[PDB]
Amino acid sequence: MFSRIRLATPTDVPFIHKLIHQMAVFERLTHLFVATESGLASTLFNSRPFQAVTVFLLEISPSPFPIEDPDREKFLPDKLNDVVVAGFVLFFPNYPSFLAKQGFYIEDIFMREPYRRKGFGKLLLTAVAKQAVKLGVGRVEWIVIDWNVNAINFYEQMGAQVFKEWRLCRLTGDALQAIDKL
Amino acid sequence: SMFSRIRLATPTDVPFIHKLIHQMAVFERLTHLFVATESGLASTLFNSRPFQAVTVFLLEISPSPFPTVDLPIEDPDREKFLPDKLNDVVVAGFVLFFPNYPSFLAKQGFYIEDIFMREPYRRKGFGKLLLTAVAKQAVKLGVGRVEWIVIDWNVNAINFYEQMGAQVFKEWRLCRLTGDALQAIDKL
Ligand SMILES: CC(C)(COP(=O)(O)OP(=O)(O)OC[C@H]1O[C@@H](n2cnc3c(N)ncnc32)[C@H](O)[C@@H]1OP(=O)(O)O)[C@@H](O)C(=O)NCCC(=O)NCCS
Numbered sequence: 001m002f003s004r005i006r007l008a009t010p011t012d013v014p015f016i017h018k019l020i021h022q023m024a025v026f027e028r029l030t031h032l033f034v035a036t037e038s039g040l041a042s043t044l045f046n047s048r049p050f051q052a053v054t055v056f057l058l059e060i061s062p063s064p065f066p067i068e069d070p071d072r073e074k075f076l077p078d079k080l081n082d083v084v085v086a087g088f089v090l091f092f093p094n095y096p097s098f099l100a101k102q103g104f105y106i107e108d109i110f111m112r113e114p115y116r117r118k119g120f121g122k123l124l125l126t127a128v129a130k131q132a133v134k135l136g137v138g139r140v141e142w143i144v145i146d147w148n149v150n151a152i153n154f155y156e157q158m159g160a161q162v163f164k165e166w167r168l169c170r171l172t173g174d175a176l177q178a179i180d181k182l
Numbered sequence: 183s184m185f186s187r188i189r190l191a192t193p194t195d196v197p198f199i200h201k202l203i204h205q206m207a208v209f210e211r212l213t214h215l216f217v218a219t220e221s222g223l224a225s226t227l228f229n230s231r232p233f234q235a236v237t238v239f240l241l242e243i244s245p246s247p248f249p250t251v252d253l254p255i256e257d258p259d260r261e262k263f264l265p266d267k268l269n270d271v272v273v274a275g276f277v278l279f280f281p282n283y284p285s286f287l288a289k290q291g292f293y294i295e296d297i298f299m300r301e302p303y304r305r306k307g308f309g310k311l312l313l314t315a316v317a318k319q320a321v322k323l324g325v326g327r328v329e330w331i332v333i334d335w336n337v338n339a340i341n342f343y344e345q346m347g348a349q350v351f352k353e354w355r356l357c358r359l360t361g362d363a364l365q366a367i368d369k370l
Pocket residue numbers: 023026027109110111115116117118119120121122123143144145148149150151153154157
């Protein structure tokens with residue numbers, strides 16, 4: 001079984017939408033998932049890779065590039081080819097101010113359930129890491145939910161530090177409107 | 183009285199930004215992690231347009247109305263924070279932020295890396311002003327969410343954030359690959 005990581009293009013938007021949806025299902029947060037394909041197509045491709053939101057897709061094939069998967073049909077970039085989008089990583093430049101240099105923040109990293117535990121998640125993170133080194137990025141950060149001990153273990157095995165002392169803060173759209181009237 | 187202004191940072195503001203980030207590191211007891219130089223800031227802060235990448239707002243204070251409360255302020259570092267040595271204007275604080283991407287919204291938001299008022303200018307409403315400025319900018323640009331992180335012992339900031347209507351979560355954990363971790367993965 002062969003694998004490839006490639007950059008997302010505008011025609012990949014349906015797959016990206018569905019992957020983010022599956023992330024929301026995994027996190028039990030579907031009520032927060034308001035993304036549309038329209039919104040993704042509007043926001044994902046306004047800059048060059050690495051300068052803003054960037055997406056890598058992991059594709060799988062039983063043949064070289066030129067497991068029960070129930071959703072296979074939803075994830076074929078081309079119906080005539082046995083190539084299936086198995087997972088993705090979505091990230092963008094951040095700014096660790098103590099380093100006075102850009103880093104990367106990983107918003108999502110996700111393998112569809114049938115392709116878990118096969119080394120593909122490692123491949124995705126490796127690809128972000130190697131790109132970070134090449135581009136002189138000094139740090140990669142993301143967040144994980146506390147019950148998600150599977151991801152935490154994965155991250156820790158890949159050499160990530162997972163802290164207990166930092167708390168996420170958020171202003172929602174509604175909170176922002178409220179402040180805006182000041 | 184004392185008058186206040188928020189403005190975008192320019193390359194000549196790098197010394198002040200450096201010193202403010204340094205004071206942030208002191209506050210957080212993380213000076214061992216503070217390796218930023220003025221050189222690095224000058225080479226990384228101004229490669230893009232405002233709001234489209236790392237962006238800094240400075241809060242300046244002047245005893246005179248600004249060429250766009252009575253309580254006197256003892257500021258020992260005033261001389262380190264004058265954009266013009268002949269001018270009665272002092273950099274009192276900053277917010278440093280950049281576009282993020284809440285994927286569930288499929289639209290850019292903002293993440294705040296630092297928000298900081300120098301100790302002599304705390305508890306006077308200026309922190310509110312900084313956050314308000316980021317928030318208003320977010321609304322104008324159609325941003326759906328603003329996020330940042332706070333350290334668990336920092337009950338002052340937590341309270342401030344909560345009073346500004348922020349949600350402060352218990353369930354999310356910060357994860358990090360250091361430079362060293364990245365080199366190790368690179369050799370796979
Ligand atoms: C987290 C995730 C991206 C990891 O991808 P993955 O493909 O399952 O992980 P890998 O198979 O690359 O695991 C890395 C290696 O460590 C091993 N390993 C040991 N314990 C592991 C664990 N708890 N999780 C994953 N791998 C583990 C794997 O077997 C693998 O070795 P291998 O190459 O010989 O198979 C994915 O599995 C997943 O769970 N996605 C759900 C979304 C999620 O949890 N997101 C976090 C947001 S809160």
